[PDB]
Structures are given as C-alpha cells and as structure tokens.
Design a protein around this ligand. Structure first.
Ligand SMILES: CN(Cc1cnc2nc(N)nc(N)c2n1)c1ccc(C(=O)N[C@@H](CCC(=O)O)C(=O)O)cc1
Ligand SMILES: [Ca+2]
Ligand SMILES: [K+]
Length: 161
C-alpha cells in the first residue's frame, strides 16, 4: 500500500501561495521539509520546481508538466498518472505543491505534513478544504519565532481515518 502524502506550509486562512514568494523566512520549516522528504520520491508542479531553482538532492524529483521539460536532472511527467508510475514501488511518495497539484492528489492522499505559520499574508491561493472529521492528528510540535525564523510555526502530521 503506497502512502501518498501531502506536505505544505500554510499561513493564516489556509493560504499557501500568492503572486510572488511567501513573505516569511523559516529555515526551520525547510529543515522539516528536508527531513521528511529525503530518500523519497517528490512530486511537484513545474512552477514549484522553478521556485526551488534546482533539483532537490537525495530524492527522486518528479516534475509534472504538459510541455517537455528543459532540465535533464529531474524526471518529467506529463500527468499525475505518469508521476505516480515514476515513483515506482516506493512506500511513501511526497506531494509538495503547488495549489493545483494538491487538489489533484487530495483524494488519493492518506497522510499530510502541515506546517501552520502564524502569518496573515493576504494571499489568494489556498490549501484544499478537507473534512476535519476524516483526518486525525498523530503528531504536533510548536515553535516560537526566533532570530532565525520570522514567524512562529506548528508542525503537524495528519492521517486519514
Ligand atoms: C520554494 N520552495 C517550496 C516549498 C517551501 N517550503 C515548504 N515547506 C513545506 N512544509 N512544504 C512544502 N511543500 C514547501 N515547499 C522550496 C524552496 C527551497 C527548498 C530547499 O532548497 N530545501 C532544501 C533544504 C533547505 C536548504 O538547503 O537551504 C532541501 O534539501 O529540501 C525547498 C522548497
Ligand atoms: Ca505563487
Ligand atoms: K538524467
């Protein structure tokens, strides 16, 4: 049973994106992202791959795009079907956005790695609205802002009932 997992950073009001990059500086979230995606296939949309600016080391990078990719260092998938097939027989595949990709994988996903950030950023792209009754929280860890992280943040792992 392949576990499909969504991993996302959510500001206030479920905001995940806006026109430009999110206005926060959270190296601790990037370290949590890295820890939870290493040695796993990682599925992302082409815009998210451009946001990163490079391949993610130590993991299988699967970028979904309708147009042919122009970077041989990652795996290019024309559809979510091709993306999942590229993940092979991995026990957990990580879906890291963006907004459209989250909507397409939500029904297939049985686990979520959510970072809740205490920032009212006023964005207009939101994480999909999921039913809270169908998910249960199995991990929770809170951190305050500090000299290195611009906002307080709460790591959470949810699993489908
Ligand atoms: C813009 N972007 C998308 C991004 C950012 N934060 C997230 N945070 C969470 N929780 N989930 C996501 N899907 C997510 N996606 C990025 C940008 C940089 C790196 C990155 O380089 N991360 C390094 C670690 C950070 C570093 O090396 O400086 C890695 O090895 O994964 C990842 C995602
Ligand atoms: Ca954006
Ligand atoms: K290659």
């Amino acid at each position: 049973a392949m576990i499909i997992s969504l991993i996302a950073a959510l500001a206030a009001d479920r905001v995940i994106g806006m026109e430009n990059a999110m206005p926060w500086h959270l190296p601790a979230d990037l370290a949590w992202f890295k820890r939870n995606t290493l040695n796993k296939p990682v599925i992302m949309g082409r815009k998210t791959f451009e946001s990163i600016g490079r391949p993610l080391p130590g993991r299988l990078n699967i970028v979904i795009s309708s147009q042919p990719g122009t970077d041989e260092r990652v795996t290019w998938a024309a559809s979510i079907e091709e993306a999942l097939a590229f993940a092979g027989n991995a026990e957990e595949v990580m879906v890291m956005g963006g907004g459209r990709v989250y909507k397409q994988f939500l029904d297939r996903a049985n686990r979520m790695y959510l970072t809740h950030i205490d920032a009212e950023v006023g964005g207009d792209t939101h994480f999909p609205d999921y039913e809270p009754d169908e998910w249960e929280s199995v991990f929770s860890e809170f951190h305050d802002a500090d000299e290195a992280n611009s906002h307080s943040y709460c790591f959470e792992i949810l699993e489908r009932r």
